[PDB]
């Protein structure tokens, strides 16, 4: 037994809702997703990109800027707001955002001032990793 059901929706959209084998979430605090035998996590998901291996067929890559998730005895549900797919709409434009974001982090001072924006920058770079992968999945 190694296949479970996971549902992840943001605001008003379906990112992944059905049978799944293993999902890997990469954001910042905890590079873990969900699998058949995960701990009872009832907190907030980390913002970044997530790779989900479908129970059978192919695998998909989703992106979310944060949300709440809950694990159940056989299934797992998660709710977030900013939702994006590896190839949501614009592909090359994802790089423009990074370049424009670099400028904002080029200078500043303080401990949690610009350093906080750094987490926001990496957040936008997470979706750039899934779009590069979709290129080699066709």
Q: What one-character-per-residue DSSP string does 70-117 give?
A: EE-SSEEEEEESSEEETTSS-STHHHHHHHHHHHHHSS--TTTTHHHH
Sign of the dihedral defined by the CA atoms of residues 122, 67, 114, 102, in that order: positive
Give the three-state DSSP class for 48.
Answer: strand
Both tokens assigned to 79: 């709710």
The closest of 47, 30, 134, 36 to 92, measured between CA atoms, is: 134
Q: What angle do CA 62, 67, 68 make, to 5 degrees?
A: 120
Breaks (C-N over 2.5 A) in the chain follow: none
Using CA atoms, how far apart are residues 55 and 53, in angstroms rounded to an integer? 6
Sign of the dihedral defined by the CA atoms of residues 122, 125, 129, 134, in that order: positive
Q: Which residues make Cβ contacts (< 8 Å) with residue 98, sequence separation at least 6? A: 121, 124, 125, 128
Sign of the dihedral defined by the CA atoms of residues 68, 71, 76, 77, in that order: negative
Q: Which residues make Cβ contacts (< 8 Å) with residue 85, sequence separation at least 6? A: 15, 60, 61, 62, 63, 130
State the structure-solving technique: NMR
Residue 62: other Cβ atoms inside 10 A: 22
- Domains in the chain with CATH codes: 2-89 (2.60.15.10), 90-136 (1.20.5.440)
Exposure letters 101-135 (e unless 16+ CB within 10 A, then b): beeeeeeeeeeeeeeeeeeebbbbebbbbbbeeee
Q: What one-character-per-residue DSSP string does 1-35 give?
A: ---EEEEEEESS-EEEEEEEEEEEEESSS----B-
């Amino acid at each position: 037994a190694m296949t479970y059901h996971l549902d992840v929706v943001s605001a008003e959209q379906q990112m992944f809702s059905g049978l799944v084998e293993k999902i890997q979430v990469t954001g910042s605090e905890g590079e873990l997703g969900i699998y058949p035998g995960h701990a009872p996590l009832l907190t907030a998901i980390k913002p970044g990109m997530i790779r989900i291996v479908k129970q059978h067929g192919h695998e998909e890559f989703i992106y979310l800027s944060g949300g709440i998730l809950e694990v159940q005895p056989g299934n797992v549900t998660v709710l977030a707001d900013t939702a994006i797919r590896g190839q949501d709409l614009d592909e090359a434009r994802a790089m423009e955002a990074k370049r424009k974001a670099e400028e904002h982090i080029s200078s500043s001072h303080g401990d949690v001032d610009y350093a906080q924006a750094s987490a926001e920058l990496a957040k936008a770079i997470a979706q750039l990793r899934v779009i590069e992968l979709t290129k080699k999945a066709m």
